[PDB]
Amino acid sequence: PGHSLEAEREQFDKTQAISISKAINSQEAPVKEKHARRIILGTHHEKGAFTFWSYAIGLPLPSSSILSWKFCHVLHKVLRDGHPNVLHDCQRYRSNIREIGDLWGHLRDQYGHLVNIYTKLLLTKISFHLKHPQFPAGLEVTDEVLEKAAGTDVNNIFQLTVEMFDYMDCELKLSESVFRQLNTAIAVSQMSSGQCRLAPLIQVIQDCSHLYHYTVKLMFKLHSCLPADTLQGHRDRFHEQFHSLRNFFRRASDMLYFKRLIQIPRLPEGPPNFLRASALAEHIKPVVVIPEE
Ligand SMILES: [Mg+2]
């Protein structure tokens, strides 16, 4: 009486501790998908991330910048693919994320610089998805849900556009910092330390593809309710982000490491002409595909 129910609870906890130790460690190698998938499925089993954090507060993050980097990569995957309730469980531990990035920000370590930039992205994701709960933290919504979240009030459309520009900036800063550490022959490399730094950009590419579609649609909605001369700064911000995004997707499309792991969409040669209302109907929604393993 009660022996099998106690043994089931103990086995769930043990599998979570083993998977966390095998995913998040100091080895200079990409996070193993088998172990990350077991953490994500655990969050669907308990409808939260409270078991994950009960063990993760014991990780010695200041001992190793590689350990801190792999911790950030697993948090990004848990936010995008875990149960929605993980967002609140993560907000409890916001200071843990802020303080590990602040530590590495004071040091010259190559991985530490990348961790500092990653922590700013993760804090922006947690804030954005608590403020705007119509958007899951993996950012995928139907056109119908995007239209409802934008609504008809120019004040709500304006605020959502500024916040999505800030979100895209945090994503592109991480891709740019990773690429600055890897030289041109990274395109035909399978070096473990290269894979360790490239692997998180699979999550970054999926976030960015969604943010690009949403910001194009919000920018055409603003051009229909405000004078063209009040929106020059917004067009200037969009144009600079578009050229950074196009250069990121093109360079990532050239990596051997990514060939079997992600199908990256083609973007147009230049940004849409927001001054011509009829250009909205010529916009193609980019669609990322993850191929069979
Ligand atoms: Mg428990």
TrEMBL record:
Belongs to the SLA2 family. Residues 8-136 form the ENTH domain. It is found in: Cytoplasm. This is Huntingtin interacting protein 1 related. The chain holds residues 16 to 308 of 1073 of the full protein. The gene is Hip1r.
